[PDB]
C-alpha cells in the first residue's frame, strides 16, 4: 500500500483523521486531531489493530527492534515513536511528521496497528525513571484508531 | 502475521468482534454480532480500511482477482466474499467461517482493510440480476471495523 489512514476515536472528545503516504523512500504523516488540552502530547503507534478493550488493547509501543523508548531523532527508539504532537489554544493539533522508521509494508509495516494520542507529553526517553524508557510517562490514552489501506 | 480482530460499530445498534486466525491455507473466522433484525446478513472483506465517511468509504468488495460477486464456495467470487452470517431471534449472529480465499499476510491479505455486515442477505450472485453479481443485493452497510492484528 502507498497510502493509509486512521480515525482516532476515544470515551472522550479528543478525535482525529491522520494521514499516511509513503514517499520517496519515506512516509510522510498529516493530518489533524482536535479537542486536546493546549500544549504537547504524545503520539505513537502501538503494536496491536485491537479495539476489544478501548485504546488500552492496543498493547505497547510498536518496538519490532527491541529498543528502548526514545524521540524521533534518536537512535535508540521504538519504531512507534513519533513523539508529541502539540495542540493550540483551540484544542487542535496539526499533525506534520516524516519518520524514517515507519512504513506501509514489509517488516515495518503499520498497517493494521494502532495510532495513540495521549493525555500528557512524551518526555522522549529522557525522564530518569523506568515509566520513561517505555512510554515517555505520555500517560493515558485520549483516543486511537487502526491504520487502513487507503485508495 | 498469524491473527487479526475487527470491531464492528456503526450509526445504530448493530456491534460485533470479529477474529480471525491463519490456519494452514485458510483464515478462521469467529466472532459474533449483535443487534441485527432475525434472519441472513451479507459479510464481506471491503477494500480500504478507511472510516472517514462511515461505512461507505471501506470501498467495493475486496476483489484483487477482478472477478464477479459470488458465495464464498463458488470458484467464481470476490476474495471478500464470505456470503452470509445468521442472526437469531434475539438477534445474536454467531461467527463461523473457514475460507481459503481471504489471507492474513501478502497480496490477498486483509489486514488493514474493512469488514462489513449488512441489512438484507447475500444472494450469492444469484439474485438474476446485475446488482447480484457486485454485491449480492446485500444492501446497506450496517456495521463495520478496520481489520487489525492481533495479539
Ligand atoms: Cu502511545
Ligand atoms: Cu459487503
Ligand atoms: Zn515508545
Ligand atoms: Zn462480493
Chains 1, 2 share one sequence.
Do not use: W
Not at 482536535?34 to 478493550?53: A, I, K, S
Not at 493550540?88 to 495513540?116: C, F, Q
Amino acid at each position: 500500500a502507498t497510502k493509509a489512514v486512521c480515525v482516532l476515536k476515544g470515551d472522550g472528545p479528543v478525535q482525529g483523521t491522520i494521514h499516511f503516504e509513503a514517499k520517496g523512500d519515506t512516509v510522510v504523516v498529516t493530518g489533524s486531531i482536535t479537542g486536546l488540552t493546549e500544549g504537547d502530547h504524545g503520539f505513537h503507534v502501538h503494536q496491536f489493530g485491537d479495539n476489544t478493550q478501548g485504546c488500552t488493547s492496543a498493547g505497547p509501543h510498536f518496538n519490532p527492534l527491541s529498543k528502548k523508548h526514545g524521540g524521533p531523532k534518536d537512535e535508540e527508539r521504538h519504531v512507534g515513536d513519533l513523539g508529541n504532537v502539540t495542540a493550540d489554544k483551540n484544542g487542535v493539533a496539526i499533525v506534520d511528521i516524516v519518520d524514517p522508521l515507519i512504513s506501509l509494508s514489509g517488516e515495518y509495516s503499520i498497517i493494521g496497528r494502532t495510532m495513540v494520542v495521549h493525555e500528557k507529553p512524551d518526555d522522549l526517553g529522557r525522564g530518569g525513571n523506568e515509566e520513561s524508557t517505555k512510554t515517555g510517562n505520555a500517560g493515558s490514552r485520549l483516543a486511537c484508531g487502526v491504520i487502513g489501506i487507503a485508495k
